[PDB]
Design goal:
The structure is a homodimer of 217-residue chains.
Chain A lengths: L1 E6 L6 H9 L5 E5 L10 H4 L14 E4 L2 E4 L1 H11 L7 H26 L3 H23 L12 H16 L8 H12 L1 H7 L20
Parallel strand pairs in A: 1-2
Antiparallel strand pairs in A: 1-3, 3-4
Helix pairs in contact in A: 1-3, 1-6, 4-5, 4-6, 6-7
Bound molecules: the ligand N[C@@H](CCC(=O)N[C@@H](CSC[C@@H](O)c1ccccc1)C(=O)NCC(=O)O)C(=O)O (2 copies).
Chain lengths: 217, 217
């Protein structure tokens, strides 16, 4: 089978779910539910973490036949290669590698904030820096429909998740960046993406786990 | 020649310097130096961060003619592709992606600890977890000379850095894992690596920046 294992939240699995849907993959999900405060029990996961044959047990994981893959970027690249959704030219591969890692840094900046006990005090600093962050992505995208040019590739699924999560956080944040606004709309307008988003499989919320200060519900 | 820009420390540039040396690359280093405590003045970098033509200005960066690259993994992959130092088969590419990301997680775990003011109280937790972490890498390597099999590739440069840095931190940590010990020796014994390491250009210390509680010198 093809099985995606992750917590029952958006988190690091959003881009993977969207890519599985876009590629018309035949997959099922193993959803782990963290317990409520105060214990935030992880037993649903911990009771099988070491029983799945994973080399480096973690969430998310993808099982595809005999392939057992962890690390969200490795999972995305695996699916992308399977469906010819990677950068082709050297210049495209450079952009792909820069963006995969840059978007991960941006993702981690937001996650660090949203789990920080000092969230309320720290949020203004994040918001002050947000337009500059977005400006750099806007400049890089330029006039192209997708981040690697005319063809959609896996890094667009990363880009969508990170950019759209920032819109959930600060609704107006993309408004100053026409190309980013149009990118979100173009992605959500893709046939398989809009089909997914009208279905009960779509899991836009909670953004983060039960322990988060923001995005826990 | 190419320009490699980074702080005047080991940090995220160790694997890149080693890969540049292994590939006989012509390069010069632009070395930045941080100020002292408590402010850790970054002016030497910040005063030219936006004057270098980088799309997402950061350290490390690599300038190779028209190619201007940030994100350490992107720099490594760029050099690796140029010299056929990447996984070839699907299984090799999956291993490569898992390890690139897994080693980054390990790297960040040690850096998070060593930069934490509460270093002393937090150290036992890291050290107790270390054997498990290394066991997983040892199991994955098995009897192979290199992490992707019989061919050395860029992920070996990442592996060497992360494993050897842990040996600096905890001198005995690889002793229980003969294949990891032997891997370190094999990497260090490559002609071009050995020549570099025995030269004055090799920069094993400081491990981290001036802000670190451990490895700041
Ligand atoms: N670099 C890895 C990070 C993987 C990771 O941090 N995984 C977290 C859940 S997501 C990170 C974050 O969204 C999250 C969600 C829910 C709980 C904790 C953290 C996890 O629960 N791993 C299993 C384990 O440690 O046993 C990756 O990209 O896959
Ligand atoms: N994901 C990125 C991380 C890049 C990064 O965190 N770079 C740090 C110095 S290294 C991280 C670490 O070794 C370090 C070194 C020195 C000081 C603090 C931290 C930096 O100083 N960037 C310049 C900037 O943000 O303007 C990468 O892999 O290249």
């Amino acid at each position: 089978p093809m099985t995606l294992g992750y917590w029952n939240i958006r988190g690091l699995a959003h881009s993977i779910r969207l890519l599985l849907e876009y590629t018309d993959s035949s997959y099922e999900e193993k959803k782990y539910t963290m317990g409520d405060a105060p214990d935030y029990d992880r037993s649903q996961w911990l009771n099988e973490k070491f029983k799945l044959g994973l080399d480096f047990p973690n969430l998310p994981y993808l099982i595809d036949g005999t392939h057992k893959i962890t690390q969200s970027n490795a999972i995305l690249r695996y699916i992308a290669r399977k469906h010819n959704l990677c950068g082709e030219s050297e210049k495209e591969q450079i952009r792909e590698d820069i963006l995969e890692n840059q978007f991960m840094d941006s993702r981690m900046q937001l996650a660090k904030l949203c789990y920080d006990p000092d969230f309320e005090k720290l949020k203004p600093e994040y918001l002050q820096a947000l337009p500059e962050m977005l400006k750099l992505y806007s400049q890089f995208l330029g006039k192209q429909p997708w981040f690697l040019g005319d063809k959609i590739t896996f890094v667009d699924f990363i880009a969508y998740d990170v950019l759209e999560r920032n819109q959930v956080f600060e609704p107006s944040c993309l408004d100053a960046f026409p190309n980013l606004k149009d990118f979100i709309s173009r992605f959500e307008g893709l046939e398989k993406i809009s089909a997914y988003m009208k279905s009960s499989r779509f899991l836009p919320r909670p953004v983060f786990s039960k322990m988060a200060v923001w995005g826990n519900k």
